[PDB]
Assembly symmetry: D2
Homo-oligomer: 185 residues x 4
Amino acid sequence: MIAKSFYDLSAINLDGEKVDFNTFRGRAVLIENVASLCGTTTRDFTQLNELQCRFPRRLVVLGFPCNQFGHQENCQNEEILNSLKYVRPGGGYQPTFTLVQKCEVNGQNEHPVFAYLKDKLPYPYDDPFSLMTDPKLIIWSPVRRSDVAWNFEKFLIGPEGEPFRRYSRTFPTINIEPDIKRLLK
Amino acid sequence: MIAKSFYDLSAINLDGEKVDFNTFRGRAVLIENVASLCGTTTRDFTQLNELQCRFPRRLVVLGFPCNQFGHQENCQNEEILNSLKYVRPGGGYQPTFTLVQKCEVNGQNEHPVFAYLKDKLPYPYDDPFSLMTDPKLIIWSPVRRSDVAWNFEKFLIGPEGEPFRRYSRTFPTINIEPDIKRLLK
Amino acid sequence: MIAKSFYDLSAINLDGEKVDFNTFRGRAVLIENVASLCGTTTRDFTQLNELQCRFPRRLVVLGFPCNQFGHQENCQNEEILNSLKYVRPGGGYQPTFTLVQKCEVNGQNEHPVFAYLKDKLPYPYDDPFSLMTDPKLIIWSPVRRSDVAWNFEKFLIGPEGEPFRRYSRTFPTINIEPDIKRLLK
Amino acid sequence: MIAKSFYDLSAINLDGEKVDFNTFRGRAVLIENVASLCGTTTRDFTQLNELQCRFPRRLVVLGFPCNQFGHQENCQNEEILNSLKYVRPGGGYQPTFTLVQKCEVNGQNEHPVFAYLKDKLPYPYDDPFSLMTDPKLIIWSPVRRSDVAWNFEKFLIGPEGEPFRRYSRTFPTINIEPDIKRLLK
Ligand SMILES: [Cl-]
Ligand SMILES: [Cl-]
Ligand SMILES: [Cl-]
Ligand SMILES: [Cl-]
Ligand SMILES: [Cl-]
Ligand SMILES: [Cl-]
Ligand SMILES: [Cl-]
Ligand SMILES: [Cl-]
């Protein structure tokens, strides 16, 4: 099931174009599962833009929209940029990083990128034990101990393709920067 | 708990203004629970506008946004018109009918208007028995036999204040018109 | 789907023998869904025996074990009498009424007897609206407004085969007696 | 929250007597969460007896009844031995090991012994990733990545008080013996 190399992976962006992970060689990669109508939407989306603009050549920031966490991404793929631009964050917000087509990160149909990353990094560094306060919010099947717990978990991979660290829903995106710098030395 | 008269009810619109149901005397009233990012959002929103424009003086159409059904209204109150205008239906869509502040229609905190209507009209005329295929989508407490089953159930009340009929999630909004005409004779 | 006559129904008892509902002609019938390890197990089981012994020829009491309500019947069919005899009620308790093989009363695989009865009697007389306080306890699919709400709902059918009344989880079995007498006049 | 030493723990047996974990010094300890009406009840209960009889002085086998997994322990404490003796396994079965009072192993009210053990041994050795196929069976709060996954997970602790290994719902009790022998060398 699981990719042998990070670089064997791929994804489809919102324009239907393939994102080939071979293009990530020599670059640090930040992957987050994202949601357009989450409580931390505005903050994480602003901070994802900031990070990508700070490291425009040496970092790839990639966001995977997902509706598994409080159903906070009910948009069709063709509606997501509109919602970000006009609703939340709103105010003309546009992503400067790559958003991919909506996927599942947990369960039987989880995206191969997330199967791979959860296998390499089975829990968040900052909060290894929490999964969910309200068990009703676990809606996928099967449920595994390594599952993404909410919108905006974060996976940092180094420039040689080795996943480095996973960060929880409570770990601010912008606070990943010191580890990005370290990996880019 | 339950209002003695339909006309004793009220609601708050999205601008924070009170909608006093006494203003509905002599008018037929169509109340739907609505959601901005539902599969039948575009159709019901278009059809609600059409009905209100067809009966601008003799009908009040009132929509209650609610996030209890697949969490298909995660917008804050101040984001709902933007989402309708720019996302879904999109294309500059504006409601011609009154939208109220987001509420709960089922459970312990259900809006007084819905407590009243479900009491007068405990099941949909066209589908009295269905409640939910997937029991995981029942997220409120307590659960009652008269509960709203999904986004866009419909309650028609006559010009003398007596609730007349309830219609299910599958009953098209525009197909309520013959009953509106009948009640307005 | 639904039987045309009450008398077209049947069930299999714990000894694997067919219970043909034609044998109920001219008799009142009390049907309950039962559970061996419920909070009201001892009371309802004692009261079901008492009623059957009071009307040994003119009443049939029939209990349908079911595991859909808090999973309070996990016994295999061959373990149920042992559990009643030695655990709860315990003390050598034996049913004087007919127990049938464990079934489902709600959802896609609901027993034909319960499909029929819920159709004729879609809510409890004494409590028409309650379904469930904790939505997590609704575990079947699909969920319908007429569904059995907990262990020990009660359905009384008259001697000419017409279902008469349904009673809720809170209505004591022994309090059905006045209606049995009335139906037997 | 978590005990500093395994030996600081205690439990109450079914007779209401304190089981002081200081009495476990110099002994290997096998702790399982158990259920009287599970699919693996007969096998695990037979195998728990066998292990205790094989190491009557050097091993303590301790079973914690728990109703969190398919509600397969609905018995009151005073009914459990009867159910084991007369229902399942039945046939006069009596435990030769210590059963404690029914508890919760997961969530806010989890037993201190299980808080301690899941902290020392956060996943099963033989199956580190599985948690639950059907998310509806996760009924406790909060849900943590280290949670017990079903009836009959197994925790082996060495004679000096250091938890050694955790085994999953699919790992046979009797197959823990080689590790018991190793710990007792
Ligand atoms: Cl750069
Ligand atoms: Cl690397
Ligand atoms: Cl008009
Ligand atoms: Cl009227
Ligand atoms: Cl008689
Ligand atoms: Cl009759
Ligand atoms: Cl020994
Ligand atoms: Cl040790």
